[PDB]
Amino acid sequence: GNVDLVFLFDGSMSLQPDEFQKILDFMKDVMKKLSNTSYQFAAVQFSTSYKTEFDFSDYVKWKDPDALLKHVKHMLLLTNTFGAINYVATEVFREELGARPDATKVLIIITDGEATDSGNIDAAKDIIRYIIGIGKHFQTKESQETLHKFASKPASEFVKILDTFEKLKDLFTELQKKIYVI
Numbered sequence: 001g002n003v004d005l006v007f008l009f010d011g012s013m014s015l016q017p018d019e020f021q022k023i024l025d026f027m028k029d030v031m032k033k034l035s036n037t038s039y040q041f042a043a044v045q046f047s048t049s050y051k052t053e054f055d056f057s058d059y060v061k062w063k064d065p066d067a068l069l070k071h072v073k074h075m076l077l078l079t080n081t082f083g084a085i086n087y088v089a090t091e092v093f094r095e096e097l098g099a100r101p102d103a104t105k106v107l108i109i110i111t112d113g114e115a116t117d118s119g120n121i122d123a124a125k126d127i128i129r130y131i132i133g134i135g136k137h138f139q140t141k142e143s144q145e146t147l148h149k150f151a152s153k154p155a156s157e158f159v160k161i162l163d164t165f166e167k168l169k170d171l172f173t174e175l176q177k178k179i180y181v182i
């Protein structure tokens, strides 16, 4: 059917400029690959605060991933992931901003650290949640486990741990092998 996908991307101060850019490039690559399909996209940057960089109605109107992410500015603050998930669930998946009432709701969280806030994400229960944890902060098994609370079940399928930012390329390769005409 229809899929309404939101990229929720980390803009924290731990990210070097080239690392932030690789996150952007990954999102653009996925959008370009899936252009003119059944998929619709929205992108939200999160750090201490949250900002919708473009919503579903923007994507439908302009279509161009490069133009849609052209004026993103790296926030450079903390990682309030609990707050960001709640933000998306109540402020982005809304019919007024172009969300389709009959689409499947998907959230892709891209982060390089553990959350600096706390709370619950009960508001996002109906949303399918993928988490991609990248880098040094996720070496220990204990740090990886913290991400499980954000992801859909089972974690083994919805949590992806990449050791370097270069590995987003490999993830994109993997995704492309699962594309089919149905």
Ligand SMILES: CC[C@H](C)C(=O)O[C@H]1C[C@@H](C)C=C2C=C[C@H](C)[C@H](CC[C@@H]3C[C@H](CC(=O)NC)N(Cc4ccc(O)c(OC)c4)C(=O)O3)[C@H]21
Binding pocket: 003, 005, 030, 106, 108, 128, 130, 157, 171, 174, 175, 178
């Ligand atoms: C597909 C492998 C790829 C590496 C991956 O995980 O892609 C994820 C994360 C990230 C890399 C980017 C992505 C971009 C677009 C779609 C939403 C990817 C996930 C696709 C899956 C597809 C899939 C539904 C389906 O098979 N459609 C025909 N589901 C539900 C689901 C999830 C896990 C399952 O084991 C499952 O069993 C049938 C069904 C989903 O929730 O989304 C997503």
Ligand SMILES: [Mg+2]
Binding pocket: 010, 012, 013, 014, 015, 079, 112, 113
């Ligand atoms: Mg960080």
